[PDB]
Amino acid sequence: ATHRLVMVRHGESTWNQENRFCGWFDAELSEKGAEEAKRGAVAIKDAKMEFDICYTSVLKRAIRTLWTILDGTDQMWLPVVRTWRLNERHYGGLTGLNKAETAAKHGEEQVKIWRRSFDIPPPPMDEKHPYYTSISKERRYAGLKPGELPTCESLKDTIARALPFWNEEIAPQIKAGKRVLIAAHGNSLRGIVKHLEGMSDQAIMELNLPTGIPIVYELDQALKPTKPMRFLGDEETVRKAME
Template identity: 50%
Template sequence: MTSTLILLRHGNSEWNAKNLFTGWVDVRLTEQGRAEAKRAGELLLEHDLLPDILYTSRLTRAIQTADIALEEADRLWIDVKRSWRLNERHYGALQGKDKAQTLEQYGPEQFQTWRRSFDVPPPPLDDDSEFSQAHDKRYAELGVDAPRTESLALVIERMLPYWHSDITESLAAGDVTLVVAHGNSLRALVKHLDGISDDEIAELNIPTGIPLVYELDDDFSPTGPGRYLDPEAAAAGAAAVANQGKK
């Protein structure tokens, strides 16, 4: 038996629009982001891909995206599970910083290392920073272990247990499973699904607001490549993500 997994990065956010490193900072969608989420819902309807269950991060931009897309597909009623394990990568001391200024200040090599290396996290964020989540109630269960910065490797380490414990359970039950999350938490999941190497994952960028669909076998391995429901828009969106920071 195969099962269907739909991955969706949230639509354009207020800080995507301002070109700021966001991470765990809880910003909302822009008008453009809402339109992308609506289009995502239309694409699901057009392709007859109607989710039975929704997984999201605990961040508002993913929750808003899911709600708008599901409303469009007339599926707001499905069960929902949220977890911090699907959150964006914690961007450490880069949270709140301008991507173009950071590139200019630190140079392209350091900038790329922080954004796309597999296991080099940015410096940790101070708990008294206005961009810290150290005292955010929604992460109370994490206590002192709440991240202050993360590499992609650390995202994989906290995301994969949730994939194995919860998301694959829905897939095994035959549910069309929608996961609405973030650029880097989805890069982590796609790395796992497609068996992408630690080096090659640097080249993978996930566009905002376009559903990416996988058919999975009984072992939750893809039976073929993931397919974006709007491949042209996805290619353009991924290129724009890759170029963030460049003028």
């Protein structure tokens, strides 16, 4: 082990409470999610963990989680890089629907196929979708090269657009000795975990990363983990996450 990497999945959003697919909808943290971020900040501060550079998405539930960590650890001065490549999976036409609405519109067996599939995408977000203008036409995506803006993503698609950011931007920083923090989303972090651990498609779909709980990796010089991921927090919080 040579390098320490820390990742955090943001806590609960307002739409997670409504069992509503958020995806690229820019949902706010709930009060519970903000408290989870503060808990993770305390754990990082207590462990005396310093960072040198931070990465997040363009979605405020992740950015706010990062901000809470930086505030609570007195690291507000650190460089922060945002990228759409760390965004949550794009749920396509399912964006904004709850579980019952999704099932009524698309079929229970069909929705089960999508939920359990690594590589079958949900339906596209088309120009008639209520959130099309506010997502697909939003100026924060205007710099994407033609062909990069998704209408929908399978998990395979999400991972395929996240990994290039890891390889080209994050990994060289780690190799230079920088201590990285990544505050992002379950499915984008899954892409990094899958790569670090060399996991199968099935294995990554069985991993539900705990929320607001910092995840610590120790990596060798080739960025290969030398031991299992560890969670930071109070004993009880950590024991639960280990389950």
